[PDB]
Known about the structure:
By secondary structure, chain A is mainly beta. The first copy, chain A, contains no helices and 10 strands. In chain A, the strands form 3 sheets. Chain A has a 5-stranded antiparallel beta sheet, with no helix packed on it. In chain A, strands 8-7-10 form a 3-stranded antiparallel beta sheet, with no helix packed on it. A two-stranded antiparallel sheet of chain A has the order 1-2.
Amino acid sequence: GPNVAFDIKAQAKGVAEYGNSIMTAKTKPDGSFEFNHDMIDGVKTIGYGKLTGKVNHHYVANKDGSVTAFVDSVTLYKYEYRNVAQNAAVNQNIVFRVLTKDGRPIFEKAHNGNKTFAETLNKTLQLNLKYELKPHASSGNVEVFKIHDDWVHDTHGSALVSYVNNN
Amino acid sequence: GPNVAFDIKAQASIMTAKTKPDGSFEFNHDMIDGVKTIGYGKLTGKVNHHYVANKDGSVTAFVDSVTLYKYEYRNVAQNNQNIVFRVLTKDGRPIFEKAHNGNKTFAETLNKTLQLNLKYELKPHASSGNVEVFKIHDDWVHDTHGSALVSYVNNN
């Protein structure tokens, strides 16, 4: 039967590809995963974010030692954020987004980073991918969704005129 | 005839003069980065107003419209930054929007007149108070955008 190593990881859009932005998720072989990120304000850590989910996949072993990996879909369960300290970039806000491979947003959460919370997504995104894998073959890195974790600084203002009759 | 003091200010980073009594103005703003200023923005325009003296001592200030000429940006320090400058009417309709990364110097021409059609009948020492004539957004995003990537290796 199969002898497949599964992983999931997150890499920031650079180009980069020097490997420094890569975060490996805690995973199980059934596809379960969990990403943890430190949120920086940026004098120190103000909180920890956690995205949980599961890749739905299954494997068929062949006689010759090759295997077929079916990557059916990927489910996102929760996004949680645990505030630890007060945000000292006090006019900046955080936006966390998850999007499909194709750029379509499916979750968005804007917040100031000072409140703990948990949001439930329970969103399954269909992939229907198949990798025919010879001995020692790798699928390589296959995007299954996108992530945005942004700092927003919004100086919103208005132009005010005034007139005084000095007589 | 008319003795009226005109002013224009920004309230909510956005500094407020220069101003001339004919209504011309410019707004200057600094983009900050850390505490090492990256560049300077400047928005120029003119308020279109005029004054009618009454026998009373009283004056009517007609605030007809405001014209926006240009938005200029000057990069002073080189270098994942989206910066967006917007101008909107006092009612919330965007009339100009510029996204940029901050590394290039540029000028955009707006030449937009926003009709105001306001009138303040001003008795001696009366004041219009603060009248909003348009809005500005000088937003700044630090992007960390990426992908979740799965991988499968056949270890046979």
